[PDB]
Design a binder for this molecule. Structure first.
Ligand SMILES: C[C@H](C(=O)O)C(=O)SCCNC(=O)CCNC(=O)[C@H](O)C(C)(C)COP(=O)(O)OP(=O)(O)OC[C@H]1O[C@@H](n2cnc3c(N)ncnc32)[C@H](O)[C@@H]1OP(=O)(O)O
Ligand SMILES: Nc1ncnc2c1ncn2[C@@H]1O[C@H](COP(=O)(O)O)[C@@H](O)[C@H]1O
Ligand SMILES: [Cl-]
Ligand SMILES: [Cl-]
Ligand SMILES: [Mg+2]
Length: 460
């Protein structure tokens, strides 16, 4: 999976940079040795997945050990952690030494991840179908399902992207994405390691931080559309940001659609374009605009090598016939953990995954996502948010009789979460702050409502 880490590297390859988090870093040899020491201490494991160097070491340790990792959002609330802990039943939690863990984890064995530890890299005994990660992803109803992602899916999607993006071990990625989802963790940490390159993780994203790294040897930027919106807003005032983007080898957006107004403001300011790629937790990456392809706003390009894609079948490349994307390939997840009926429902009889995403293809083969088959989802900041679980949390509040949750457009977030409340007392309805704080404390801050509306009645 990482031939530059296992077996332990030697000579010049060993002293190449691997991970950089501000002034903290690890070379390939240092990462292999620190992850190896950790791997020997874990013969499923949870990872307290802060946007910090320890998270890279922890996940690489699990992969070297051949033990599935379950990334935890360090801002998850009590309900959300209890569910993941009960569902995935990890043996231990890998955490940074100084992390304050919440009481939901009080009974779990804590293994501190030491980035200065030096141990042997375990022998690789893993099989390609072995679970690599369990990544919790929201559905339209109920609590998040654990997508079990096999080792082979990681290798194949990362190598497919290497071909599409002309990504090599000479590339230096900058990113500031969360490390408990696929974009930040798989593409943004494991991808550079599989390639033999490096990543500079910003901790918290900022336009200034992205500019700094791209003006100082970073060659690629990955972000969600919200980050590109904030870049587009800042460009007129920020000459060094404009130069940073103009000089980049590749700018990539994903997790949600990049609006054409943001695309074109970036092109106006910098003279170059942002590649979009389309993927899902359950499928990893499906399509991308290629580095050697024509840049086309509002598209997600062509199927990646090894991905079988169809629209439903619609065979005309007409830019007009709307159909459901379905995919098959070694990029696919194994199952939803403990959910065999939901797993079976996600697949056609002949083994294609039903994405729910609606698309056309143009005469060049390019895919444009234009909607949904039956059921909108909510994407806020490039997080997929499930309405039903936000409703279920709001219903716990004593000032809420009934609740419905929807998304509405937001120029910065793509969509913002709306809470529709039948109050306990219509003359004293619960304020947004009380409801938002409650959902943040139960679920996670990114899932909080940003708007509240009161009604007499909501769907049952
Ligand atoms: C597989 C699929 C994909 O990327 O294709 C995914 O993993 S989507 C899930 C990945 N999405 C993300 O990483 C969400 C990243 N977004 C954020 O970090 C935040 O929303 C933000 C920093 C852009 C803005 O946060 P805020 O505090 O303004 O609200
Ligand atoms: N570049 C993109 N354009 C439009 N939608 C996207 C793109 N990348 C991912 N998505 C959406 O994100 C979903 C997967 O996100 P997730 O459920 O968080 O794994 C897909 O089903 C799409 O709806
Ligand atoms: Cl750090
Ligand atoms: Cl959060
Ligand atoms: Mg619903």
């Amino acid at each position: 999976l990482f031939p530059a880490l296992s077996p332990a590297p030697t000579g010049a390859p060993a002293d190449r940079p691997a991970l950089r988090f501000g002034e903290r870093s690890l070379t390939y040899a240092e990462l292999a040795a620190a992850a190896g020491a950790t791997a020997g201490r874990i013969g499923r494991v949870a990872v307290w997945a802060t946007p910090a160097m320890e998270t890279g070491v922890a996940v690489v340790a699990a992969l070297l050990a051949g033990v599935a990792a379950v990334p935890l959002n360090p801002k998850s609330g009590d309900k959300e952690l209890a569910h993941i802990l009960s569902d995935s039943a990890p043996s231990l939690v890998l955490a940074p030494p100084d992390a304050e863990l919440p009481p939901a984890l009080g009974a779990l064995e804590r293994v501190d991840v030491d980035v200065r530890a030096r141990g042997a890299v375990p022998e690789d005994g893993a099989d390609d179908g072995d679970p690599a990660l369990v990544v919790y992803t929201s559905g339209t109803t109920g609590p998040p399902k654990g997508a079990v992602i096999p080792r082979r899916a990681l290798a194949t999607t990362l190598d497919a992207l290497a071909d599409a993006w002309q990504w090599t071990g000479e590339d230096v990625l900058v990113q500031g994405l969360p490390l408990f989802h696929v974009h930040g963790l798989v593409l943004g940490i494991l991808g550079p390691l599989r390639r033999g390159g490096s990543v500079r993780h910003l901790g918290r994203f900022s336009t200034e931080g992205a500019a700094r790294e791209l003006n100082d040897g970073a060659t690629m930027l990955f972000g969600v559309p919200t980050m590109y919106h904030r870049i587009a807003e800042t460009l007129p005032a920020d000459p060094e940001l404009a130069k940073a983007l103009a000089g980049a080898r590749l700018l990539v957006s994903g997790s949600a659609a990049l609006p054409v107004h943001d695309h074109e403001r970036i092109a106006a300011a910098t003279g170059r374009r942002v590649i979009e790629r389309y993927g899902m937790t359950e499928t990893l990456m499906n399509t991308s605009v290629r580095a050697d392809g024509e840049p086309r706003a509002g598209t997600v390009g062509v199927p990646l090598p090894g991905v079988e894609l169809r629209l439903v079948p619609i065979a005309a490349l007409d830019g007009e016939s709307v159909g459901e994307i379905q995919v098959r390939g070694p990029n696919l997840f194994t199952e939803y953990l403990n959910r065999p009926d939901a797993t079976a429902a996600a697949f056609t009889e002949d083994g294609f995954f039903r994405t729910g995403d609606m698309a056309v293809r143009d005469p060049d083969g390019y895919v444009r996502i234009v909607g949904r088959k039956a059921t909108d989802l909510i994407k806020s900041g490039g997080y997929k948010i499930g309405a039903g679980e936000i409703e279920n949390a709001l219903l716990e509040h004593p000032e809420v009789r009934e609740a419905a949750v929807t998304g509405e457009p937001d120029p910065d977030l793509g969509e913002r979460i709306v809470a529709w409340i039948v109050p306990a007392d219509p003359a004293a309805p619960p304020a947004l702050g009380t409801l938002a704080d409650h959902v943040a404390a139960r679920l996670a801050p990114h899932k909080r409502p940003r708007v509240v509306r009161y009604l007499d009645a909501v769907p049952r």
